[PDB]
Structure 1
Amino acid sequence: MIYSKVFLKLHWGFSVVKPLAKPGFYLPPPTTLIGALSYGKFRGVDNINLYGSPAYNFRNIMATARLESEGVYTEDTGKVYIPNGRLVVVYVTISKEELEKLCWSITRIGCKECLASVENVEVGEAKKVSRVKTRYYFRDTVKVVGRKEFLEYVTFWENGYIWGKEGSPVRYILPITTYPLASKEVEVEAKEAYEVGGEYVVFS
């Protein structure tokens, strides 16, 4: 499994709005992360017959991200403010050319006003291991060490790209401090996890 790492800047922040009062999500779901990658190849088409969103075929690109600064949550329509901050994204899955060419062209993470940016990337080969230290968020059934104090429970969606259809409800644990927003590390003893560039990743 090849992989690519990328560093990102954000001009003002991301403002993904919860579906179903307009609360907002603390950290963007992977659906936005894969749509930002699909933007590179599917520019110009806002609707293609599957009708639904054009990024209905990029559902096998499993990848994650995490923050590397301090941010705030605001409601004035839930939003997250982290101007001039950093965001690291790890793509782990098509050949290296696809990832390294779609990844250098990443724009507009989230809403149209939630402009994003790409700083630098790198490429390599990943390795699979099953006690590792990670930072990126993961699913709910993943097991954590004896201490549990800095975890938030969030609801996310899987097969919901088709408009007019409801996304699947899945719980996902983000190791996050609610106020102020930051990321905290957690050793994991699970069955399915991946190591990438020293920074270990946990999946299930």
Structure 2
Amino acid sequence: MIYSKVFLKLHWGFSVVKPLAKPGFYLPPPTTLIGALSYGKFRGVDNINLGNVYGSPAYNFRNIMATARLESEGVYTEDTGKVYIPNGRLVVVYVTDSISKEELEKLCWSITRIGCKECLASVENVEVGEAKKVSGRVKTRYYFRDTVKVVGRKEFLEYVTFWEENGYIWGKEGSPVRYILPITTYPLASKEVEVEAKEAYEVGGEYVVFS
């Protein structure tokens, strides 16, 4: 199981509108991160024949694990929800085993935006390595699933609804999955939360929790 870290500098912020008044999300979903990763290889094509229906040029990277977190302060504003965090930093962690280190690093250096067109984002540095799996009590900053238990004080937890990869095909709605975010609503920032969990990869001290 290999892992990679990437540091992104944002220009003005990101904007992803909730499916189904147009409120937005607080942090990008894993689908957006996987698509941003896949952009490095599938650049220039917008419709590929999956075999039965044209749904997206991204239904092939669906088995890559990804998380992300903030490192600065920003504000969520509706005026079409947006998250303004100019000149901020975003740290993204990719954990997978499908491709070798070289391919993942090459695709990691090839990220241009997160969400819509305006949300450009530069790349400052990357790291590649091998991760280890543990199950003891850990402290994390990246968001995780709803089913994961919690030992600390419930003070900085929020609930959001994300979708699986099934939504990659047009004319179809993805399955709803609950997620827990360790975020302060105003102003936006990230806080550490201690969890027990069952699977957690050590990617440099900042343990990442998946289940």
Q: TM-score range by the shorter chain?
A: over 0.9
Q: Deviations 1:58-86 (Å, cap 9, x if unpaired)?
A: 00111111000001001000000000000
Q: Is residue 38–residue 58 contact of structure 2 (8 Å, CA) maintained in 1?
A: yes
2:58 is equivalent to residue 55 of structure 1? yes
Report the 3-state secondary structure (helix = DSSP H, G, I; strand = E; otherwise coil) of the residue aligned with 2:149.
Answer: coil
Report the 3-state secondary structure (helix = DSSP H, G, I; strand = E; otherwise coil) of the residue aligned with 2:139.
Answer: strand
Report the 3-state secondary structure (helix = DSSP H, G, I; strand = E; otherwise coil) of the residue aligned with 2:186.
Answer: coil
**Distance across 2 between alignment mates of 1:169 and 1:3:** 27
Q: State the match for 2:44 in structure 1.
A: 44
Structure 1 segments (4+ residues) deviating >6 Å = none
Q: Deviations 1:80-133 (Å, cap 9, x if unpaired)?
A: 000000000111111111110000010111101111121100111100000111
Report the 3-state secondary structure (helix = DSSP H, G, I; strand = E; otherwise coil) of the residue aligned with 1:118.
Answer: strand
After alignment, is 186-195 or 73-82 more displaced? 186-195
2:103 to 98, 101, 105: 98
**Distance across 1 between alignment mates of 2:6 and 2:90:** 8
Superposition TM-score, scaled by structure 2 size: 0.95
Q: Give the unaligned 5+ runs of structure 1.
A: none
Q: Deviations 1:162-192 (Å, cap 9, x if unpaired)?
A: 0111011000001111111111101111112
**Distance across 2 between alignment mates of 1:3 and 1:203:** 14
**Distance across 2 between alignment mates of 1:47 and 1:76:** 32
Q: Displacement of 1:195 after TM fit? A: 1.1
Q: Is residue 152–residue 193 contact of structure 2 (8 Å, CA) maintained in 1?
A: no
Q: Displacement of 1:146 after TM fit? A: 3.9
After alignment, is 193-202 or 134-143 more displaced? 193-202
**Distance across 1 between alignment mates of 2:45 and 2:204:** 35
**Distance across 2 between alignment mates of 1:117 and 1:57:** 25
Instruction: Give the aligned length.
Output: 204
Q: State the match for 2:173 in structure 1.
A: 166
Q: Displacement of 1:159 after TM fit? A: 1.6
Report the 3-state secondary structure (helix = DSSP H, G, I; strand = E; otherwise coil) of the residue aligned with 1:133.
Answer: strand
**Distance across 2 between alignment mates of 1:146 and 1:56:** 37
Q: Give the unaligned 5+ runs of structure 2.
A: none
> Between the two proteins, what is the percent identity of the paired residues?
100
**Distance across 2 between alignment mates of 1:191 and 1:4:** 21
Q: 1:124 to 1:146 in 2, by over 3 A?
A: closer
